[PDB]
Amino acid sequence: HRFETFTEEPIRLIGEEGEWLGDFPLDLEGEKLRRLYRDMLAARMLDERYTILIRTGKTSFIAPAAGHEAAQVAIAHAIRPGFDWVFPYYRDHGLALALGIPLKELLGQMLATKADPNKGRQMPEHPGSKALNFFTVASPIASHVPPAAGAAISMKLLRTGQVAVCTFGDGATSEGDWYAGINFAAVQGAPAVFIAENNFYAISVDYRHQTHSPTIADKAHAFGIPGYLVDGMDVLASYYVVKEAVERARRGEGPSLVELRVYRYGPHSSADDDSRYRPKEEVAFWRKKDPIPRFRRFLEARGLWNEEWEEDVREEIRAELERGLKEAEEAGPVPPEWMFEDVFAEKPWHLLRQEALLKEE
């Protein structure tokens, strides 16, 4: 019914051998459990497809999300897509995918083609969708926390019954705006859920040098809101705790801070060298905690998984990826004139002049 706050050990629901560890009985249909797995696989494969986009030069930058799948897919399923709002950051393409954002739009933004509803205005890993309330990613770390708080306050005043989820890494919790935004949301009892995808690294800076609080969940005490420590490699534990936080917010009980402990298997980004500041013992250790194989065992133990289904799912996903990429590419390059559009609702005199000057070029 209600998870424990500030727990000593991270909350986990999936046993080492695929057994259910929850006090309450599992209440998700087999179809839904398979959906969760499907989405994680799609997320992992999207990530690997991104790697290829780098190698072929189709995209100039990527932020490997491998290892974040359980957390990202769980979040996507704890809210109501198209109704609730999501304020993500650059590494959430897995969450974006499971939320329902068309591959066409994601790959379109990665490649900066007309398929990008964001019109190729930003560098890769900056998705955004009006239709799915996926607040367009901004580069400055934690800068989207105050806005998330605001949207939540808006939902409360307008009594829309919506919820706003805000995701960010461990490093983000050190920014002043992170604290300021949440503090305000907490004071207003706003329906917002702040979720940390803690991978113990902010590029090369480790958690030990990031903050002195033993956990991120503890930071919740600074706002007087509940904080949860969760195994982010456990898709069920992540879904249920975030789900509970979301329901709490939706019923007007205020925000919560959920810490999903995960691990970044790839380098910080395509412009980094992971195996240049991390102990192989640590990486190896965590590679055995991969959320996908872990949930696979849980499904297998219940007759919800088999090798043949694995193959079909992977092949369906691969086909979709190709279709999506093809559509994004065929959309064509964004027009040069678009550079002067959307700065304001309409172009003022100086932009018209600047555009005109450029056109003469």
Partner: protein
């Protein structure tokens, strides 16, 4: 009805809030207290805590939440207690608010207003605010307005609240109650982006706005005593500014002096001056002269000297005339 700027601003908010339930006011001490300058007096009492809300002491939270509210469904009018204090929430303003429409390809908009008192020029026991408009003008995506009359205060604030683009609204504290003016109670707005001709002249163009208005007007009067007709042009909107109005005046007079209390270097008047030189070189009979705040932090003791004086403005006018 005659009223001070405070009264006009207050009436503008009251009016807009009565017209649209989505218009909300948020900031430090804006509710119960009615604001440190009383601009929001009585609003909480009339519209309630869900329409007028005191916020925690964080400019990042104020600017940022306003952006979130605007993107979602409200028409927030945020207040930064003093222009100087916008900095703690500077990133929210320039990275989130200013670029929302652009970075989202138009999917998300920021129909919000951020008002704030600015400038010094008065010792009423309140903080002297160094005008930071240049920071805003330099940032693409923000509309910037600075008013100097009760009539303009009401007309433009209402215009900003209806404008879908983010608007930074500067209110010169020295002008909050410095003079009453006839302000229609009927609904009316003024156009953002258009300058106001305060006085027509043919020998000298005095480009100005906000805080320095008083000294600039008196300087024109002094000049009149000497047979010199100065055209005083209050830009009002710093972004996008009235290019036409400026150039038409300079073209006529052939000589111009730009005045502001903002620091000189990379200031907004520097922009206008550089643009006049780049486009109307052939129409200049004298160099565009800039009378601005000095390139030092705002001095409390020498406030009288930092804020451009009538004398400082006249010395520049003379230099432009004798050239």
């Amino acid at each position: 009805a005659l009223m001070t700027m405070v009264q006009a601003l207050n009436r503008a908010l009251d009016e807009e809030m009565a017209k649209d339930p989505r218009v909300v006011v948020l900031g430090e001490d804006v509710g119960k207290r009615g604001g440190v300058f009383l601009v929001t007096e009585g609003l909480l009492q009339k519209y309630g805590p869900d329409r007028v809300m005191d916020t925690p002491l964080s400019e990042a939270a104020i600017v940022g939440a306003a952006l979130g509210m605007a993107a979602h469904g409200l028409r927030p009018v945020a207040e930064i207690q003093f222009a100087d204090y916008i900095f703690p929430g500077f990133d929210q303003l320039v990275s989130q608010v200013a670029k929302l429409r652009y970075r989202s390809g138009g999917q998300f908009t920021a129909p919000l207003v951020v008002r704030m008192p600015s400038g010094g020029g008065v010792r009423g026991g309140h903080h002297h605010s160094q005008s930071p408009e240049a920071h805003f003008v330099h940032t693409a995506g923000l509309k910037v307005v600075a008013v100097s009359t009760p009539y303009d205060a009401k007309g433009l604030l209402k215009a900003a609240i209806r404008d879908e683009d983010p608007v930074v609204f500067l209110e010169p504290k020295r002008l909050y109650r410095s003079v009453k003016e006839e302000v229609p109670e009927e609904d009316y707005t003024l156009p953002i982006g258009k300058a106001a001709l305060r006085r027509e002249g043919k020998d000298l163009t005095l480009i100005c706005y906000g805080t320095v208005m008083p000294e600039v007007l008196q300087a024109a009067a002094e000049l009149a005593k000497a047979g010199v007709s100065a055209e005083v042009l209050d830009l009002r909107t710093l972004m996008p500014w009235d290019y036409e109005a400026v150039m038409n005046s300079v073209a006529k007079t052939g000589r111009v002096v730009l005045v502001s209390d903002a620091p000189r270097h990379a200031s907004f008047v520097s922009e206008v001056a550089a643009t006049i030189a780049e486009d109307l070189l052939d129409m200049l009979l004298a160099p565009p002269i800039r009378v601005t705040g000095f390139d030092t932090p705002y001095p409390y003791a020498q406030d009288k000297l930092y804020l451009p004086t009538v004398t400082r403005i006249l010395n520049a006018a003379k230099r432009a005339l004798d050239y």
